[PDB]
């Protein structure tokens, strides 16, 4: 393998210890600490999941009874289960906030490539693990999730020759499927730790809390000066989350989304398809499937979202040609009388207003997409929510199209002002 030149860092215990004992971190704010929160939540997820594994027997017909009985006879088991669920929630929250923050700072440059992609891959893997975890609940929610995943897997093969059997045996949750998925969940959850370590090592090459290049050269020593601040910011965000959850969720509630988790596989055969809803983090994808009734187009939308999320630095980056790359433009060619356009250069973050407007439109579209369930019972018979379609289409356009990111208007206007001023002053 001569094509592979090498590795940025050799993750040996000696060198890792030295690197983390000599690491320096520049002064930062809370917005640039979501990565540490994600990593700490990953560590707690590892610990709590290890504790849970010693209680969960992978037989589907015993998981509900085992969970119910081992919460009483054993102390702290239900505490660890609650910690695991809330850790998944906070892990999704921190990961998406980190993604939004890194999209905001325009980290699609070439020097960020290794930092960016290594992160996205981790995120991608972090998705798969979550899916497997859901299956372990052995509720009707797990049944529906497994069925949808099996249908998506079988989509690639045109429904020929049961290529899904090695994992989704019969497309149903049984002893074999549960055992295999639980073991894969454990192994990939532990692999996520190594992936996160690799990403954290890579990203330190060019780390910035803000886009503006502060001239400071002195930096904090990571072990305690930065670590204490990271832990404190984690504490503050956890306090805020506790307050919001305490007030937004009354102790007894009516019509929660957990009501679909009543049905346990095996015990209850009939499924209340009227109220089918996943956890909020997988809510956007189920909403997309409901909005796009076409199976192939929905699968393509999911794959495109994830992969374009992976390939941001390539579409929007400098591309090593130093902004001499030529785009393909539909209509601007007529206005400029040129087939192609040189990539614009001045695309700062804090200063320009177009970038902020587009980014916040994208973020609000994502929030609206996760805001509710389209309720496919008559979501199409009734003309569907136009806001959901607008938000999905803007998400697709923002990720992939370079006219909403690095727009040409700013560069042309700045050059016009430059030309006018130089002509006036010669």
């Amino acid at each position: 393998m001569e094509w592979n030149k090498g590795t940025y860092m050799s993750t040996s215990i000696k060198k890792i210890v030295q690197y983390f004992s000599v690491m320096t971190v520049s002064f930062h704010d809370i917005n640039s600490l979501f990565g540490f929160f994600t990593f700490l939540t990953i560590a707690s997820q590892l610990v709590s999941g290890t504790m849970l594994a010693f209680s969960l027997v992978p037989e589907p017909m015993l998981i509900p009874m085992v969970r119910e009985e081992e919460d009483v006879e054993d102390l702290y088991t239900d505490d660890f289960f609650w910690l695991h669920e809330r850790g998944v929630d906070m892990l999704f929250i921190f990961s998406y906030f980190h993604l939004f923050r890194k999209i905001y700072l325009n980290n699609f440059e070439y020097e960020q490539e290794a930092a960016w992609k290594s992160g996205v891959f981790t995120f991608l893997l972090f998705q798969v693990v979550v899916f497997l975890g859901l299956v372990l609940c052995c509720t009707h929610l797990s049944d529906i999730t497994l069925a949808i995943a099996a249908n998506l897997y079988d989509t690639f093969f045109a429904g020929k020759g049961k290529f899904y059997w090695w994992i989704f045996t019969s497309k149903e949750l049984n002893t074999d499927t549960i055992i295999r998925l639980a073991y894969l969940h454990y192994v990939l959850a532990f692999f996520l730790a190594y992936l996160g370590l690799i990403h954290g090592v890579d990203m330190h090459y060019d780390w910035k809390n803000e886009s503006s290049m502060d001239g400071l050269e002195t930096e904090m020593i990571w072990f305690d000066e930065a670590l204490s601040n990271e832990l404190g910011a984690m504490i503050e965000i956890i306090l805020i989350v506790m307050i919001v959850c305490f007030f937004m969720y009354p102790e007894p509630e009516a019509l929660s989304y957990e009501f679909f988790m009543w049905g346990d596989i095996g015990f209850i055969n009939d499924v209340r398809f009227l109220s089918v809803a996943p956890h909020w983090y997988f809510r956007p994808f189920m909403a997309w499937l409901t909005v796009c009734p076409f199976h192939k187009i929905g699968l393509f939308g999911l794959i495109y979202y994830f992969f374009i999320l992976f390939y941001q630095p390539v579409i929007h980056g400098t591309n090593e040609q130093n902004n001499y790359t030529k785009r393909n433009v539909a209509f601007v060619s007529f206005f400029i009388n040129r087939s192609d356009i040189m990539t614009p250069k001045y695309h700062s973050v804090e200063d320009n207003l177009l970038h902020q407007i587009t980014f916040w439109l994208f973020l609000c579209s994502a929030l609206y997409v996760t805001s509710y369930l389209p309720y496919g019972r008559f979501y199409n018979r009734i003309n569907g929510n136009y806001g959901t379609l607008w938000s999905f289409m803007y998400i697709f356009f923002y990720l992939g199209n370079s006219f909403l990111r690095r727009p040409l208007i700013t560069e042309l206007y700045l050059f016009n002002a430059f030309v006018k001023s130089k002509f006036l002053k010669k």
Binding site: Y205, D351, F415, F418, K425, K426
Partner: protein, 327 residues
């Protein structure tokens, strides 16, 4: 297989459709300067056609939300547009091409001052947020007009093109990162690039370019087609320049003063073949002196020099004072 002579090329790139490949004298890759391309494109988009008409109507909004916004933020930070436009913070922080070019060509101060100006603000903003730069720093920030920042920007971009970007030959490439991830593993660079397929040889003639007419037109009067000789043209030109100065406070003059049009007309007359004595000799002398100084590259006087060090070993590292007849 050869990309040229492929069935598609044989059927399409034929003299009948005028799509044939034409072979000429060898020429460098990246034949077109980016600064000139953007100048011509900006002129075409703003001062011609329906696009020009639309963009002229948007001058107020663009000036408010794209120029005065950046200027206000920079002044709040004790900076100017230069600090954000001459060298982007991306290049200033982490960019190996910029680092190498600066090391090989630039004097250290040209970037040291850029870094220290931001250090001034961010030594306080990080310590305590919400920092508003005091008036004395804001004054020196406001002193420099955009008319010199544009000169610096054009000089830097033209130098980078003529010296480095004009001596580069891109090639087909695999993933730069030696990452084991399969998604990064099989990244293919070279296809989906317009330049890659537009010309398969370094001898091919260039098929898309700006006509000489457009290049010459883009060097005229940015504000519009006027006639500074006739009084009617001068009135409209002065009106447009005044509204421009109003829209852009620190572009050509301080936001409280007015532009001296007589000096501008004298400069135009001196630069071109048109000449006359309608201006005072003092005005002509001042204009010539200003023109000479503006185009004069600063040089070192070799005066007021500090002392160079010639260190010597301390006393304890040297032999003692005494020295007697050895034998």
């Amino acid at each position: 297989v050869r990309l040229e002579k492929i069935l598609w090329e044989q059927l399409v790139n034929v003299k009948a459709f005028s799509r044939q490949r034409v072979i000429g004298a060898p020429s460098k890759w990246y034949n077109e300067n980016r600064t000139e391309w953007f100048k011509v494109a900006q002129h075409n988009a703003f001062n011609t056609g329906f696009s020009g008409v639309i963009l002229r109507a948007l001058e107020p909004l663009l000036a408010k939300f794209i120029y005065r916004w950046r200027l206000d933020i920079a002044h709040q930070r004790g900076l100017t547009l230069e600090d954000s436009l001459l060298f982007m913070d991306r290049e200033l922080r982490r960019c190996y091409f910029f680092e190498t070019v600066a090391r090989q060509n630039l004097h250290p101060y040209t970037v040291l001052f850029m870094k220290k100006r931001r250090a001034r603000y961010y030594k306080v903003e990080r310590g305590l947020r919400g920092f508003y730069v005091p008036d004395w720093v804001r004054k020196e920030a406001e002193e420099r007009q955009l008319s010199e920042t544009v000169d610096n920007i054009f000089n830097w971009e033209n130098f980078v093109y003529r010296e480095y970007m004009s001596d580069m030959t891109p090639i087909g490439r695999w993933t730069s990162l030696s990452k084991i991830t399969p998604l990064d593993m099989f990244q293919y660079y070279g296809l989906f690039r317009n330049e890659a397929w537009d010309r398969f040889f370094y001898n091919e003639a260039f098929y898309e370019s700006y006509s000489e007419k457009e290049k010459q037109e883009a060097n005229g009067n940015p504000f519009g087609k006027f006639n500074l000789q006739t009084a009617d043209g001068r009135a409209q030109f002065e009106k447009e320049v005044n509204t421009f100065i109003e829209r852009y406070p620190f572009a050509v003059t301080k936001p409280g003063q007015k532009f001296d049009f007589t000096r501008f007309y004298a400069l135009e007359d001196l630069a071109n073949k048109r000449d006359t004595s309608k201006y005072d000799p003092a005005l002509l002398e001042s204009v010539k002196n200003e023109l000479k100084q503006s185009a004069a590259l600063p040089a070192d006087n070799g005066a007021n020099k500090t002392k160079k060090s010639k260190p010597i070993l301390p006393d304890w590292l040297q032999p003692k004072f005494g020295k007697a007849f050895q034998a």
